[PDB]
Amino acid sequence: IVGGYTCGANTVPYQVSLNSGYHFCGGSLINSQWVVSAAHCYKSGIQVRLGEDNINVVEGNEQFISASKSIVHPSYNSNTLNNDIMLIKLKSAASLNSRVASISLPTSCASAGTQCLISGWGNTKSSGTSYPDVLKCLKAPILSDSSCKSAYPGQITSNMFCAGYLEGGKDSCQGDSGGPVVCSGKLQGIVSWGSGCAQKNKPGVYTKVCNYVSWIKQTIASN
């Protein structure tokens, strides 16, 4: 997260870190046994880390649970990033508490102008590299479809939205991928892609979760 703030320990209780020896992506806990992330975060050997603040220090609220199954969206296209969503099932159910909690799926899609909370352990610099140990947060509005498409001609599908600031300076970045965009207490986005980070006229692009609620629910119901 570039241009954000330190969230505070365990203040984003649905935020998970995906670990394969190291943090490599975010995700969102949606019930005691399932996480939503980005398909472009797929790999084998995932351990889901819940209850994290400092990802390099055991602070006492963590739960580390291996993935038993990963399910990339049936229509994910890694070239266009259309349908950039995956589900991860945990080998055991997380113990839910005030610091480890699920985030509701959206009943309805969100509109441009709605404020959201974007979070992660990604790079905090737009030029160069600095990775935080503690969770970072950014408040950002959803941008209109027309301004998203104008920023990225020929690239924005109906399964994507932009959020952030056209002036630059505030954005998600490398290592935030797969993490949450939460608006009015609902998971509306997944950190997906953008050109660089925090550049003028290049806001972040996010997977539009409301399009996937039916698939999420039916996948959970049979897996």
Q: Which residues are catalytic?
A: 40, 84, 177
Q: Is residue 171 a known part of a binding site?
A: yes
Q: Is residue 59 a known part of a binding site?
A: no
Nearest to Ca ion of 42, 121 (CB atom): 121
> To the nearest whole angstrom, how small is the minimum distance from the Cβ of residue 168 to Ca ion?
31
Angle at 54 between CA 51 and CA 58, to 5 degrees: 70
> To the nearest whole angstrom, how small is the minimum distance from the Cβ of residue 161 to Ca ion?
31
Stretch of 52-60, 125-133, 171-179, 197-205 contacting Ca ion, by CB under 5 A: 52-60
One-letter amino acid at 113 equals: G
Stretch of 54-62, 64-72, 116-124, 145-153 contacting Ca ion, by CB under 5 A: 54-62
> To the nearest whole angstrom, how small is the minimum distance from the Cβ of residue 11 to Ca ion?
14
The DSSP secondary-structure symbol of 217 reads H
- Cα(167)–Cα(7) distance, integer angstroms: 23
Stretch of 55-63, 147-155, 173-181, 203-211 contacting Ca ion, by CB under 5 A: 55-63
Nearest to Ca ion of 23, 208 (CB atom): 23
- Cα(93)–Cα(31) distance, integer angstroms: 9
- Cα(222)–Cα(8) distance, integer angstroms: 36
Q: What are phi and psi of 219, to 5 degrees?
A: -65, -45
Nearest to Ca ion of 6, 146 (CB atom): 6
DSSP track, 13-36: TTEEEEESSSEEEEEEEEETTEEE
The CB density around residue 178, as the number of other CB atoms within 10 Å, is 31
CB-based contacts of 128, cutoff 8 Å, min separation 6: none
CB-based contacts of 214, cutoff 8 Å, min separation 6: none
Q: Is residue 172 a known part of a binding site?
A: yes
> Coil, strand, or helix at residue 213?
helix
Q: Is residue 177 a known part of a binding site?
A: yes
Nearest to Ca ion of 9, 220 (CB atom): 9
Q: Is residue 12 a known part of a binding site?
A: no
Q: Which residues bind Ca ion (CB under 5 A)?
A: 52, 54, 59
The binding site for substrate comprises 171-172, 174-175, 177
Could you list the residues known to form a binding site, using ranges. Answer: 52, 54, 57, 62, 171-172, 174-175, 177
Annotated binding site for Ca(2+): 52, 54, 57, 62
